[PDB]
Ligand binder design. Sequence first.
Ligand SMILES: Nc1nc2c(ncn2[C@H]2C[C@H](O)[C@@H](COP(=O)(O)OP(=O)(O)OP(=O)(O)O)O2)c(=O)[nH]1
Ligand SMILES: [Ca+2]
Ligand SMILES: [Mn+2]
Ligand SMILES: [Mn+2]
Length: 430
Amino acid sequence: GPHMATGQDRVVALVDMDCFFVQVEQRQNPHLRNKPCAVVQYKSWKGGGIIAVSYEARAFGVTRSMWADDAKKLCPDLLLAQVRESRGKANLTKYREASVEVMEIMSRFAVIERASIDEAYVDLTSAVQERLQKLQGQPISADLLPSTYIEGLPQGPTVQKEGMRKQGLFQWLDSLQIDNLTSPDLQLTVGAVIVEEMRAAIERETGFQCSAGISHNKVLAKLACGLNKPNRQTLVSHGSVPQLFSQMPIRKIRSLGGKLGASVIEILGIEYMGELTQFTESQLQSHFGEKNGSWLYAMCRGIEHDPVKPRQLPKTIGCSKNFPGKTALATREQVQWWLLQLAQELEERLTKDRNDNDRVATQLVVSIRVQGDKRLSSLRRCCALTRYDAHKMSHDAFTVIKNCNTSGIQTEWSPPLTMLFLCATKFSAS
DNA sequence: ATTATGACGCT
DNA sequence: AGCGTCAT
Ligand SMILES: Nc1nc2c(ncn2[C@H]2C[C@H](O)[C@@H](COP(=O)(O)OP(=O)(O)OP(=O)(O)O)O2)c(=O)[nH]1
Ligand SMILES: [Ca+2]
Ligand SMILES: [Mn+2]
Ligand SMILES: [Mn+2]
């Protein structure tokens, strides 16, 4: 009733760049613009592996994790851009630098949480209060929301998509009470106005288009962002949650797309997010643990409390390379050469990071995979990172992993290594 | 023979 | 600390 918290305290947005690596390549090369196109890593094996796909190419069935040769079967005119290769490995610097461009624009509007290379959460609660006071009670014109969808609308009492979008927006705005500076629906609407402005600034100043979600928490904002892509934003109100969740497969909610979500489905015998409302908090905690149980109990009612952390920079800086099948490293010279290549890339990125961001990493994490292990990582070991020197870092990594070589021969490495990974962690201000 | 990351939870 | 999960 009156004391039942509804999770409507905050306004949170999620801004996600559309097909980001493709847009970076399309900015650089105009010949790729408005084309079916994809970004690939490497080329010799099956044409390279696709990691990003323009919406034109998606219409043909092209997807991430597809080999380029197979994508070309679906889309013979598909255009491809390759990730840069440096020191024998894919180098993603161009996309990291483009990401910094976008994140710095977003940070002008509010403090952001970098959630991935192409997305950030925004806590707009205070910006919304300021804009509401600057308003002084005039309604919000639909002209201020030119790319906004209102999830669940229109409803009740019409042939084109833009017309449907505008009908839903008109229903939403007509139902607004603009006199109540504490109305959550009004707060979300002002949040969407601000996100329109943020997205316009990103496109004006970078050329990049993005989508966004606006809701009361991170999970709903992320979910909202996905509802209308590309180049659109979606408002998910608290009131829209029962209908939205009533046919929402559990796996669509962030953190439930893996084993835990599969267990919710199997143990409870349900399919959709909304079905979770029928269980008590103690029932859910009994199946899924105290933390997960409380999280599920609140989240199936649209409520989630995870804060937008004030963090624009990555917490770790890492370098990794797989050595699949017959390219696995089987000699000491090979292992050392590749550790050096990874360490040289890491030194370059770290030195740039120190100059830009006034911090130094203090811990080096070395991870490997051995042939025959299905796990991502077969072994992780840390050591001290006291100098940004690639030769020292690669020698230290070799020292912490050399006990893995079960070969009696000094020169051979067995079982062969199918992955190397170096990660700099535990930053301190400098 | 998807690949290259990055965050966070558990014990 | 080292391992697992989730994201993609
Ligand atoms: N190296 C590498 N990069 C990846 C992988 N998956 C995604 N990326 C990169 C390429 C994408 O452009 C970028 C952002 O990922 P997203 O999941 O947001 O998709 P994207 O922006 O491409 O499309 P979207 O419009 O958001 O659906 O991350 C991967 O497995 N490996
Ligand atoms: Ca994206
Ligand atoms: Mn993303
Ligand atoms: Mn994607």
